[PDB]
Amino acid sequence: LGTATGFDFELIDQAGLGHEKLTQARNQLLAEAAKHPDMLTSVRPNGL
Amino acid sequence: EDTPQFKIDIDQEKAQALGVSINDINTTLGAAWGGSYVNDFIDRGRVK
Amino acid sequence: MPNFFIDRPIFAWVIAIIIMLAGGLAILKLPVAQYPTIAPPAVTISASYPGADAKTVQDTVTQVIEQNMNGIDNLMYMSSNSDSTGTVQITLTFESGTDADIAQVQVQNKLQLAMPLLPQEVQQQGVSVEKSSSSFLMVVGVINTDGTMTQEDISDYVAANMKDAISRTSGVGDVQLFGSQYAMRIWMNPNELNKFQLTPVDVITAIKAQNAQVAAGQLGGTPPVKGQQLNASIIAQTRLTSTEEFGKILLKVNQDGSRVLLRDVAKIELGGENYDIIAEFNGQPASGLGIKLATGANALDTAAAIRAELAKMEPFFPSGLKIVYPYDTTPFVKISIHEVVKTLVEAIILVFLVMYLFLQNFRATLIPTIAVPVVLLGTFAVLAAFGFSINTLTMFGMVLAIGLLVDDAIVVVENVERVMAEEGLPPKEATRKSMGQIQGALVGIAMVLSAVFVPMAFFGGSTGAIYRQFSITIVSAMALSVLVALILTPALCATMLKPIAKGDHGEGKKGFFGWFNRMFEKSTHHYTDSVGGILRSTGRYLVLYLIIVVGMAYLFVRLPSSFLPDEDQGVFMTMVQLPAGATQERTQKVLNEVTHYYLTKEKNNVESVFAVNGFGFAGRPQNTGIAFVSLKDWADRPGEENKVEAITMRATRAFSQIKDAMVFAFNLPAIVELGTATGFDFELIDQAGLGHEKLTQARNQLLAEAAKHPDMLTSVRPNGLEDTPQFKIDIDQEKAQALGVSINDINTTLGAAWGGSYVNDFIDRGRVKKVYVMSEAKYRMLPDDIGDWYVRAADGQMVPFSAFSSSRWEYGSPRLERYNGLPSMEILGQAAPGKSTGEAMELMEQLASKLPTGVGYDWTGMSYQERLSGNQAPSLYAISLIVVFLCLAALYESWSIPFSVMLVVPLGVIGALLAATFRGLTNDVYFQVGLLTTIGLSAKNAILIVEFAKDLMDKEGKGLIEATLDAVRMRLRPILMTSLAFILGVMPLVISTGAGSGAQNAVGTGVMGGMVTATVLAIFFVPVFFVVVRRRFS
Amino acid sequence: GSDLGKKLLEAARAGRDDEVRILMANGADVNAADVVGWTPLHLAAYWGHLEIVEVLLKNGADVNAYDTLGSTPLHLAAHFGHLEIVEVLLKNGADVNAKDDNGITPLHLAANRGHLEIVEVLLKYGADVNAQDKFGKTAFDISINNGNEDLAEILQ
């Protein structure tokens, strides 16, 4: 079912950008999520 | 409808006498006229 | 509801008509087979490794496949054989009710992912995954009479011009070729090979080069040069098609310029893929087709269609070629149908005669003549709904229910005829009152008989699936009989029967019917006087009852147990087993002797001998063979002396003379998967990596101990093969490297020459076929021949095999067995005469716990299913007894009165046991279902006696003895009528000696004897039961 | 080959002492051989049945009988580690330096399977330690190639 109030997000490379550019895009999205503590909590990557 | 066919005939005995292997002939004829799938490469992050 | 339909006879007719059409439709569309699917689903994985020994096959093929058979649903167990014919068979057996298609696809999917781990030679041959079954519809023999064709030539003709057409024939599910299509056989000569400094490696290399498909391309292929007008395909080298072309394959161009062709170093012919089997039909070369019936197909239609297609092929047959039918089930199945229809028609005729003998009006005789067919037709419609086939079990299930169907008809009509005679009521008013007396009992009977038969359907395994066929057939027929008894029969009685004036019992008539009525009325008073006397002294009859109960229990334990009677199917088998290491030619000489016996000593009885040399059921080495004997038609074999059982015994006694060859004949079983009567199937398992030799010692230790208990265990032998001498050759790696000889060239030369090698495919008259290189026989027979094979070194010198090898004799297994992934050895045996399989199995377990450390055991096949079917029996017997009691308790509104009905059980069983014992029959499936129907009908007779008796006490306030005496008086005529009709009805089955007489005898004998005692005893004992039970409880 | 000869081959193999006893009393051919040239003594030696090896030698079995590849019962007993049978065969006059068609001796076979006790017995009865097979290999050459330290030290 899930983890109560938890979301399971998937960032996608739709234009053959590559791993390096997609990692930056992930970091940009992780940084912006930290700037909204009132809405989002423990927003982190599942990968390595 | 029935189609015309160009039957090429390799003389293996005459080829062996000239010092050329049949495998090199088969690959040369096949690769040139029909094309040959060699292996894969990576085009903008996709196997092709 | 009977009242409803007495006033609405057209509605009743409508219901009868709908039932008749539904049944009529069912009879046309219902599948037909000898037997239905019984055995639990099994999937077989089969692979060939040309020239491979048992251990090579096991350790490169079998173990890898076994290790990958994971994540498959409903697997019960797994067993495998790896033998020195270069063959592996893995059998995965699934839980009963598993979808066979899902089981098979799950198995072959896991195999597909294991294929990359198998040797290249095994991947090339391929690994077959098939639904397992052993029941052939028929075997079509193909022979040559003018000596112009070998078995290999016939096999190829059948494969090319017959097999595919038969596979496409309507109702044909599977076709096995008895042989292979041709292979291109390159028979190598090592003298000629060494002469031109050549090896089998060069032969294989040249065949792969000069027999191959080569891709080219197209002229004006895309993308083109714009303006291109012509586009055509380029055809390069394509596969060779003839022995001539293979002969001309170039191997070497010598210094002087002369050519070394493949025909210069080898004999080249179209031959078989394998030469292990030598098939003969009356001494003539033979191939053939093994044909299996498709799921839901009609066996009789399919067999006709096969013969119709074979007829169309007749004109194109080469001279001397002929079709023969050594095995065909459909003649037997056609006689089963005829004999069952004959029995059901005679049954209806006998009811007509008995009904007229007692009631003496044709209007009465018409009512059962309508009602019984309506029920029988309705029963087919319900069988169809449950997806059942018209088979031996479902057909004899209806025969066993005849007594119950006939009684429902007789009971309803007779009771109307009595009520009219005793009270003077007109037919309509008489039918209302008559049904009023019995309608509650008929419903009670329906529930009781449901309680008896329905639990029989919930036995697991193979025996469960057999009992399930009878259970649904009998419950359905019984259930419809009661519906027809409450709907149609009352309506027919109300509208068809003539009135009878009060007091008219036909005593005033003249002739036979006047005499009979006077005699039977006088006999009814003699009966009521006897019961009067019995009921004055009930004590000694409770003593006689316990003598019957003890006699029953005694006769039960003495009666040998079995499954299905052996039949004369016009065929039987002869096993030929020579000593281990014996050659194909030695086995051939014994088969020639066995064939000569049958066509000499049994020329009157035997039509054909099908001699298969190099075939066995527990491995097919060179020292094994079978002779399949087909007899002349039943008509031309009169008397017990000329039947399969007599011929079998004579053959076995004659062949016991034959020296250094175990030879014996035996009849085929009804169904192969059930096994022998009180046989067991034991697996000895290596649980700690002990190895083949230590497991053999453990096997011998168990066998030696089993032999010391002949009182319990009989014929406890291994199913497998004994270790045999084998030729260990060691390649010296240092000597090979010193002389510059590669191990690949050594191993290929040895393997190709002595074992054979599948190189690639060619196309023979539009059909893809295999190319095999192998040594011509004379250069691969003896150890000295090893030295005649040369391998070319790097420096070009030819090195003999003797130079770099050493050899010695050792012992090894020609067949290695595995159970659930571990090394195993299958041990067969049976309980001693008078002992149960349970006892025999219990001792084998006790003996097994005394074997060395790391040696375990398990039960498989029939033994696995018996352990799981035996544990259900107590529960199902208990549920049956409890629901019967509860149904009678509800009917009679009493916790006590039920006992008066239930006490009847032994009265029928004792007669069945006496008749079976006396005639020398067994406690088989047919006998057991016979007891239930005999118990069922006697219970029915008793139920109505007790209902009538109890009603007279409740309503008319009569006394226990008065009520009981009036009850049995009224019930005497209907009980005797049913018994007279039904006993006469089963009489033909008892005396029958024809085809299918084994089954008929088993159905008839127990039922006849059971009905005789059930009838004679119940009429005296049921009143005793009721009086004793009413006295004891208020 | 006789009826009782075949029975004796099967009995000698299976280790059925009591059946061999009865067969010796009825004069079952002790020199009976199967198609590969194995006598009852060969079979008894291979499968390690001591009692039957002793009984067969008492009843005039050929201790130096050889199969179609020149292998003797001592070859088999030495190779498969049957110490007691090796001693009995050697005491009843078995050729300790018997060579098969490959030039292989009981010492070669025992050395190969690392049967130290058997190697000592063979050397005690005068086994030729310098004996070479068809490849010029000694029992010592086998010990160093197998990396058997104990064995290599004894074959000094």
Ligand SMILES: CCCCCCCCCCCCCCCCCCCC(=O)O[C@H](COC(=O)CCCCCCCCCCCCCC)COP(=O)(O)OCCN
């Ligand atoms: C299986 C468990 C699963 C759950 C299933 C639940 C359902 C259970 C079955 C229910 C059956 C109950 C029957 C209800 C009938 C009510 C009618 C009362 C009136 C009456 O006397 O009955 C007459 C019929 O009975 C008679 O006259 C019949 C004769 C006397 C009794 C006969 C006994 C029948 C046989 C018993 C077999 C044993 C069965 C074991 C389960 C109909 O009169 P009327 O009302 O039309 O008249 C007009 C009056 N104004």
Ligand SMILES: CCCCCCCCCCCCO[C@@H]1O[C@H](CO)[C@@H](O[C@H]2O[C@H](CO)[C@@H](O)[C@H](O)[C@H]2O)[C@H](O)[C@H]1O
């Ligand atoms: C091999 C088959 C054997 C089957 C077993 C036999 C049982 C079936 C046969 C029953 C025959 C009944 O026969 C009946 O027996 C009783 C005995 O109690 C006799 O009854 C006699 O003894 C009783 C008790 O003293 C008296 O009350 C009575 O006046 C007297 O006639 C009946 O007059 C006779 O007609």
Ligand SMILES: CCCCCCCCCCCCO[C@H]1O[C@H](CO)[C@@H](O[C@H]2O[C@H](CO)[C@@H](O)[C@H](O)[C@H]2O)[C@H](O)[C@H]1O
């Ligand atoms: C083309 C038709 C194919 C029919 C396939 C037949 C399957 C038989 C395979 C097993 C044969 C090996 O032989 C082994 O099984 C037989 C089963 O018939 C056993 O036969 C046993 O069962 C028979 C049932 O009909 C009885 O008639 C025998 O008295 C009884 O001994 C043999 O005692 C046993 O030696």
Ligand SMILES: CN(C)c1ccc(O)c2c1C[C@H]1C[C@H]3[C@H](N(C)C)C(O)=C(C(N)=O)C(=O)[C@@]3(O)C(O)=C1C2=O
């Ligand atoms: C066992 N069986 C019913 C029979 C009966 C008569 C026969 O004459 C033969 C068989 C089995 C079949 C099996 C087939 C098999 N196959 C269908 C090609 C097969 O692969 C082999 C094999 N040894 O692998 C055969 O011997 C075989 O060619 C063969 O020679 C047979 C054969 O000749």
Ligand SMILES: CCCCCCCCCC(=O)OC[C@H](CO)OC(=O)CCCCCCCCC
């Ligand atoms: C009227 C009371 C009848 C009770 C008996 C019914 C028992 C049947 C239970 C069942 O479903 O098993 C069917 C079974 C399958 O092999 O068929 C049989 O084997 C027949 C069993 C007959 C037992 C006779 C009993 C004598 C002592 C009381």
Ligand SMILES: CCCCCCCCCCCCCC
């Ligand atoms: C009307 C009769 C119903 C029959 C149902 C039988 C189900 C009993 C299951 C048997 C297995 C029990 C093992 C202990």
Ligand SMILES: CCCCCCCCCC[N+](C)(C)[O-]
């Ligand atoms: C095959 C169906 C035959 C139906 C014939 C039955 C006729 C019933 C008429 C009875 N009746 C109403 C006249 O009394």
Ligand SMILES: CCCCCCCCCCCC
């Ligand atoms: C398994 C349950 C069997 C039912 C038995 C009920 C018997 C009740 C007896 C009441 C006596 C007054």
Ligand SMILES: CCCCCCCCCC
């Ligand atoms: C395994 C299913 C058994 C069900 C039997 C019910 C038979 C009823 C026929 C009317």
Ligand SMILES: CCCCCCCCCC
């Ligand atoms: C003396 C014994 C009397 C028994 C006669 C029973 C008559 C039954 C007729 C069906």
Ligand SMILES: CCCCCCCC
């Ligand atoms: C086409 C075959 C029909 C056979 C019907 C058998 C009815 C018992």
Ligand SMILES: CCCCCC
């Ligand atoms: C009144 C008769 C009842 C029948 C129900 C099946």
Ligand SMILES: [Cl-]
């Ligand atoms: Cl009439």
Ligand code: NA
């Ligand atoms: Na190799």
